[PDB]
A paper describes a structure:
To test this hypothesis, we design helical repeat proteins (DHRs) displaying regularly spaced carboxylate arrays on their surfaces and find that both protein monomers and protein-Ca2+ supramolecular assemblies directly nucleate nano-calcite with non-natural {110} or {202} faces while vaterite, which forms first in the absence of the proteins, is bypassed. To enable exploration of the contribution of the size of the protein-mineral interface while keeping the chemical composition and geometry otherwise constant, we employed Designed Helical Repeat (DHR)39 proteins that can be shrunk or extended simply by changing the number of repeating units. In contrast to typically designed protein surfaces containing a mix of positive, negative, and non-charged hydrophilic residues to promote solubility, and to hydrophobic protein surfaces designed to bind other proteins, we designed surfaces consisting entirely of carboxylate side chains spaced at regular intervals to mimic the carbonate sublattice on different crystallographic planes of CaCO3 crystals (see “Methods”). Here, we describe the design of DHR proteins that template growth of CaCO3 crystals.
Author numbering: 1 to 384
Amino acid sequence: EAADEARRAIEAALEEARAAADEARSDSTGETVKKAVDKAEKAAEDAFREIKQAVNQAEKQGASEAAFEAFAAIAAAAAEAAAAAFEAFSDSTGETVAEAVAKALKAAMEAFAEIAKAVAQAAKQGASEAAFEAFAAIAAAAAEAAAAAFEAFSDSTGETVAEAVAKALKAAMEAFAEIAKAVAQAAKQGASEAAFEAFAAIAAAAAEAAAAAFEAFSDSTGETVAEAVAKALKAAMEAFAEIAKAVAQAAKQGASEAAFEAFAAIAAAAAEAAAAAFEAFSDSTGETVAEAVAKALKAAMEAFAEIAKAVAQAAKQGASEEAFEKFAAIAAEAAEAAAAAFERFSDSTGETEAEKVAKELKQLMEEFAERAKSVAEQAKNGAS
């Protein structure tokens, strides 16, 4: 009766979303408003039908009852994210605003369906209940970021502002889907519960940086600033995705607990640096300063991905605990440097000073990645 309670809860979430689609629809009369709402309402339904199917695919493969409790936790977060893409819609009724609203709700829905299928894959691969708790945490983090993207949208109605908002919400969604897939691969590879705890922290660290970039967007509706915010959030998302994949490869290698701890600290160091580059953007609405900001965050999203790929290569070699600590200390030292290049830029918005501090953050990022790679190659030889 466990999968039965899951299907009924799944049908309570789909129903709670259609009512939310109706709750936003009674307060709208423009034709383009009802169009995109019917588009957004059809996107959460094809995702709701895809959730009951994964609840049935793990029934033929009779998963543990922890898989059905994560499917109900994922359906519930699905209903809340549609009601969030609709609560932000309630303050708007323009064509492009509703269009990007439908696009963003379709982005978190396709990401939600992909998470349930990954939960189903681990079910046939009979994972641990720590993977299920990480699945509910990854789904909860997904809802917190889509809702934050909508709240930031509640402050803006610009066509380009809403377009980059939908482009950004899809970026973390595609990043979140890739995280759930890696969680499924390690589930087939039956890794530890320290990996799933770091996976929950990685899902949270993603939400922190996404909400921060949106919080920075709550200060700017200039098309040049919105795209820079969107392209930046995409960089950190592509970074976090690579960090989740690396967290799975060492899980295939079956490493120690200190690795996932440094992986959870690396995801946090990424969040701190991403929010910092956004917090300095809260003091700059010039085009050239905005580009230098997002370009450095791209250089920082590349650096963090390298330091996570390096910590994984030492876990495959079976290294000591001093490596993951030095890896986490390089991640935080990188965060202090990317935050410093942002607060000092808050005292210079001339194009020359912006691209100058940016290029130095790329030179230092390549140096930090060189420092992380040096730490890895030293641990492979058996260093004391």
